[PDB]
Amino acid sequence: MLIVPYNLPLPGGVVPRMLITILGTVKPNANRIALDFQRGNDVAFHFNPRFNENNRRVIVCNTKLDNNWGREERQSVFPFESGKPFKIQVLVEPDHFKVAVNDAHLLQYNHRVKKLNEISKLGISGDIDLTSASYTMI
Ligand SMILES: OC[C@H]1O[C@@H](O[C@@H]2[C@H](O)[C@@H](O)[C@H](O)O[C@@H]2CO)[C@H](O)[C@@H](O)[C@H]1O
Numbered sequence: 001m002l003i004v005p006y007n008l009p010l011p012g013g014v015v016p017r018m019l020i021t022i023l024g025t026v027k028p029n030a031n032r033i034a035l036d037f038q039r040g041n042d043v044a045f046h047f048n049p050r051f052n053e054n055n056r057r058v059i060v061c062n063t064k065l066d067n068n069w070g071r072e073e074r075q076s077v078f079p080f081e082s083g084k085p086f087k088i089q090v091l092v093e094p095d096h097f098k099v100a101v102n103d104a105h106l107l108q109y110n111h112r113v114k115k116l117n118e119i120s121k122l123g124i125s126g127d128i129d130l131t132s133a134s135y136t137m138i
Helices: none
Strands: 006-009 018-026 033-039 042-053 056-065 073-075 085-092 096-101 104-110 121-126 128-137
Touching: 006 128, 056 104, 073 104, 121 128
Parallel strands: none
Antiparallel strands: 006 121, 018 085, 018 128, 033 042, 033 121, 042 056, 056 073, 085 096, 096 104
16 A cells, blocks of 8 residues: 555666566546656656547557657557556566566567666556555566
């Protein structure tokens, strides 16, 4: 049980083989979830399930640099369901963040922010009950 929005420090930033695991349950009538891997004020990797964008469900991924959002990458495969427990695993690989939900590969996001060791915080927000947020090296 954790308070949302939740900040998970990532000491010394991220590095390949680092696995971040988030467990929670989507609230009924959820509108959004967001993971924000941050480098100071910049967002290296924004992972944003949207439950009702023009009556469609979509995951939007992007990067924010100097307060400007870049080119969105959109995934219509949408494994989250209102009211249900989920597990998000984010594995840092040399060229991308690799995301699996409920043990199924979902998407990859190529590193736009190159200074991995400066991506030192993960913000977790949105319409969830957050159970746990942790990391380990695999
Ligand atoms: O790109 C991720 C980013 O999207 C933002 O959406 C705003 C605006 O609300 C939309 O109407 C428009 O399509 O895009 C802009 C900027 O990209 C949203 O506000 C942020 O929270 C992020 O999800």
